[PDB]
Design a protein around this ligand. Structure first.
Ligand code: GV6
Ligand code: ZN
Length: 917
């Protein structure tokens, strides 16, 4: 009957998050109130921070990977904002290319329709990108992220298309944009060249065959043998029609078997065990003496030159390599080395064309057949020359959006050259590969291992094929002079076109005549010029975002180079590399100072998610079930630099952490809710325990901050959680509960406790604000004391505070040392544990302790162990080397339940006083 005489100590801040209901209201408010613009306009901004957004493709709804990405960017940006900086973060969308165009192509199929008008086709692509840009923008905002989402950048904006073109212009004028004719990746499904970032290597089954090419009569006579046939190994019977040579290893021994097969001696043992060749060797020859002999192709009876390759391998195959210059890059260079024909009779759709008849390379029945469908019939046609057929599996390149296997076709395309010296901005001379490698060494990678991934790619990469044979993209908008057969790179022409794109967009390249695309100076010679109609690799679009966004807006959307970029691990093959290369051409450095890489969302078994496999976890369902602040906490509280597995068990762990933080903030708010805000002006006498908590708060705050500075949010959250769980809840709040609930509101020691709780909630708000922004906004909404103490209207006014200044602490105050008393506490609690299960007592408050160590502050002992008496009493309960435990020789107080009453059912002296107030 004393419960209503206690301090109420409640807050309107609720235990339950109600996140599905409350979070949309917060995020809608931030949109309506233009919170991001308010952040940028903050009057006392000091220093600048630029995160340059890498642009997601404007196709589809968001998945959990996009959420991971944008949430990490948001934590990084909000950290810098709350450190006091002016922030720049303009999100963007990647609107061109097959990620958009393939969806139009597939829908036209399903509807059984076609769209051949270029302007109308580009319009359907553009409308699709516009549609999903808005969908994605709103789904991003539902995660609580803040950026310039009402003014995002778009690669389909006319000014951006011009910026991309002007970047290409800079490459051309530095001498790095050149035509090459060679075999390259070819996607037959979309009738386009491809480069590396547009291929996905996947396991594929293939025929694997060993084929005898008999030496011609005159070559047998020169070699002085009766029978000899070189054996080749190939997995592509579809290229045998284009054979012109058989390449051997230089200065290497070739064995001739009794049945007359000629293979590398080093491989004969393996080949005979396979049954490709017979076991007996009759003669050995040096490949140097075999060069310029001639064999016969069993498929079509054509000559095949015996040639010497560069670096022919002896781990695979036979040591004799079927050479088809039209369908292999190294083959092509060998063919030119020996002035051989480049046979290439495979069209843009991957089908054999009339060249096989004109050149007598393959039977006419194959005309129009797809090369992969023809292979079975080709293999059957080989007859006795087929020595062995297997089926193998190997990693094979596939088109990134049609998912069909690619082939290689000799073709003329446009490239950025990697090993071509060009004039540096400082006047020196270096190749792009050299510049990029030097640039990488100036970039910080998080984790540092990511440097090695990008560096190895730059060390090994080939020339970058830029030209694509689709319509949705930025054209390589140069004219060829027919009088010279070379491109026109005159600045007046290039600037004229760039200005037209900036005002009208690239549709004009298809619509306008050559004369109408030329400056008036040139229009009389318009008859001599023809347009290049190829469009740029979409990876060149996105590689140019630093120029189009950071440079062309002169710092208004962030500096070049950016301070941070942050993307998934596939962007070393992608956007990190394209942006590095273009930045090194234009600026001779990377357009970013730091690269943070995150892993991929994968299922509970570590496997990739796909609608095909049935293992896709829905972002919308995840948000509905847990709320965005829980999804955000899951991101921050996990090892995001490696792949992240999604499962109910891991989200249940995160929910328990969120509940612990939330329940802690509720308790804090409840227990300084009644404090007279005049307290905030005056200093207080703090107890040793108070000081221990303030000093501990400062030590853990430094550790959290250092961890968050290194982007190790797990480490920082673990420090914060341990403080919340152990020192705060376990030690301080337990020890303070009596004063908080049972001491007078005027009690100066209670007021000091409340100031410690205020300072503690203040630091929790500051450190959690980048991660749980909605929840900290809610905390401030419900606590007038915090808003006054922090001079904060809302979460966007938070700053790191000096607890020392706010609480008026003395400069040279010597820290508490609690090692001895906390060791006594743990030892007492272990002994109390044992007495409880024996039934000897129920609670620490029933006990008296006499400590043999006279050196300890006895009131601190009583405070920390929550005994009701320090000293000697009558009934001995137990004894250790450090202390003796007795039953407290008092009654339980009916108001505070401490054993401090001299009379049964009578308020103790403290409570008596409080009740009389
Ligand atoms: C930087 C984007 C470039 C230019 C390109 N448009 C692109 O890849 O766009 P998108 O495919 O939509 O991806 C945009 C960003 O999401 C990241 N991402 C994609 N899938 C996943 C996934 N399962 N798990 C985690 N992250 C993912 C990707 O790593 C990039 O950080
Ligand atoms: Zn009492």
């Amino acid at each position: 009957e004393y419960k209503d005489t206690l301090n109420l100590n409640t807050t309107t801040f609720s235990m339950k998050g109600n996140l599905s209901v409350n979070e949309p209201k917060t995020y809608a408010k931030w949109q309506e109130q233009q919170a991001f613009k308010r952040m940028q306009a903050r009057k006392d901004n000091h220093g600048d921070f630029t995160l340059h957004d890498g642009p997601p493709y404007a196709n589809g709804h968001l998945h959990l990977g996009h959420a991971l990405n944008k949430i990490l960017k948001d934590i990084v940006v909000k950290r810098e904002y709350f450190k006091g900086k002016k922030i720049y973060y303009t999100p963007g969308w990647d609107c061109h290319g097959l990620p958009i165009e393939q969806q139009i192509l597939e829908r036209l199929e399903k509807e059984k329709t076609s769209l051949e008008n270029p302007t109308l086709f580009r319009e359907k692509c553009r409308d699709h990108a516009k549609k999903f840009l808005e969908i994605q923008k709103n789904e991003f905002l539902q995660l609580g992220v803040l950026g310039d989402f009402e003014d995002p950048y778009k690669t389909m904006d006319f000014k951006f298309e011009a910026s991309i073109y002007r970047a290409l212009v800079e490459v051309a004028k530095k001498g790095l944009l050149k035509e090459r004719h060679k075999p390259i990746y070819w996607s037959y499904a979309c009738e386009s060249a491809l480069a590396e970032a547009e291929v996905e290597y996947k396991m594929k089954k293939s025929p694997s065959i060993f084929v005898a090419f008999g030496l011609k009569k005159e070559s047998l006579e020169k070699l002085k043998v009766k029978k000899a046939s070189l054996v080749i190994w190939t997995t592509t019977p579809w290229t045998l029609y284009a054979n012109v040579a058989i390449a051997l290893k230089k200065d290497a021994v070739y064995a001739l078997t009794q049945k007359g097969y000629l293979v590398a001696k080093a491989l004969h043992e393996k080949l005979a065990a396979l049954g490709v060749v017979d076991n007996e060797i009759t003669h050995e020859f040096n490949s140097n003496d075999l060069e310029y002999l001639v064999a016969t192709n069993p498929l079509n009876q054509r000559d095949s030159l015996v040639a010497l390759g560069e670096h022919v391998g002896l781990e695979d195959g036979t040591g004799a390599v079927h050479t088809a210059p039209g369908h292999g890059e190294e083959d092509y260079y060998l063919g030119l080395r020996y002035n051989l024909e480049v046979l290439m009779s495979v069209d843009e759709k991957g089908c054999y064309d009339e060249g096989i008849i004109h050149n007598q390379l393959l039977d006419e029945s194959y005309l129009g057949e797809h090369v992969f469908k023809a292979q079975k019939r080709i293999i059957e046609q080989l007859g006795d020359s087929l020595l062995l057929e297997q089926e193998i599996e190997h990693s094979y390149p596939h088109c990134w959006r049609t998912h069909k296997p690619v082939i290689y076709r000799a073709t003329t395309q446009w490239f950025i050259l990697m090993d071509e010296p060009f004039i540096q901005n400082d006047g020196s001379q270096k190749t792009l590969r050299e510049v990029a490698l030097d640039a990488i060494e100036k970039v910080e990678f998080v984790p540092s291992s990511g440097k090695n991934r990008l560096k190895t790619m730059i060390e090994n990469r080939p020339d970058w094929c830029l030209s694509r044979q689709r319509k949705w993209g930025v054209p390589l908008a140069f004219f060829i002079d027919k009088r010279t057969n070379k491109p026109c790179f005159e600045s007046e022409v290039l600037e004229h076109v760039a200005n037209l794109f900036e005002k009208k967009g690239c549709d004009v390249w298809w619509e306008y005549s050559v004369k109408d695309l030329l400056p008036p100076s040139y229009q009389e010679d318009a008859k001599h010029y023809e347009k290049i109609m190829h469009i740029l690799d979409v990876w060149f679009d996105s590689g140019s975002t630093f120029k189009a966004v950071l440079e062309d807006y002169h710092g208004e959307k962030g500096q070049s180079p950016s301070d941070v970029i942050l993307e998934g691990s596939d962007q070393h093959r992608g956007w990190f590399q394209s942006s590095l290369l273009i930045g090194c051409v234009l600026n001779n450095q990377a357009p970013f100072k730091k690269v943070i890489t995150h892993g991929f969302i994968v299922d509970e078994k570590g496997e990739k998610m796909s609608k095909s496999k049935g293992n896709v976890v829905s972002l919308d369902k995840l948000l509905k079930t847990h709320g965005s602040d829980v999804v955000r906490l899951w991101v921050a509280f996990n090892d995001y630099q490696n792949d992240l597995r999604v499962s109910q068990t891991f989200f249940t762990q995160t929910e328990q952490h969120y509940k612990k933080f939330r329940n802690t903030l509720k308790f804090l708010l409840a227990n300084f809710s009644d404090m007279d805000l005049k307290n905030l002006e005056r200093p207080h006498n703090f107890s040793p325990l108070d000081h221990f908590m303030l000093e501990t708060l400062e030590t853990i705050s430094a550790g959290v901050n250092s961890a968050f500075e290194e982007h190790d949010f797990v480490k920082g959250l673990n420090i914060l959680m341990a403080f919340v769980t152990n020192e705060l809840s376990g030690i301080y709040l337990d020890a303070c509960k009596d004063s908080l609930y049972c001491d007078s509101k005027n009690n100066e020691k209670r007021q000091a406790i409340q100031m410690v709780l205020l300072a503690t909630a203040s630091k929790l708000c500051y450190f959690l604000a980048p991660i749980l922004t909605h929840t900290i906004e809610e905390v401030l909404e419900h606590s007038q004391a915090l808003r006054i103490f922090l001079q904060a209207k809302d979460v966007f006014d938070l700053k790191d505070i000096s607890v020392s200044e706010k609480l008026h602490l003395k400069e040279f105050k010597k820290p508490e040392n609690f090692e001895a008393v906390l060791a006594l506490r743990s030892a007492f609690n272990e002994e109390l544990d044992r007495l409880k299960k024996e039934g000897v007592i129920k609670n620490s408050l029933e006990c008296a302790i006499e400590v043999k160590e006279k050196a300890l502050d006895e009131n601190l002992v009583e405070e920390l162990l929550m005994v009701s008496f320090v000293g000697i009493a009558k009934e001995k309960l137990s004894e250790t080397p450090a202390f003796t435990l007795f039953k407290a020789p008092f009654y339980k107080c009916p108001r505070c339940w401490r054993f401090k009453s001299e009379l049964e059912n009578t308020p103790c002296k403290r409570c008596e006083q409080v009740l009389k107030e």
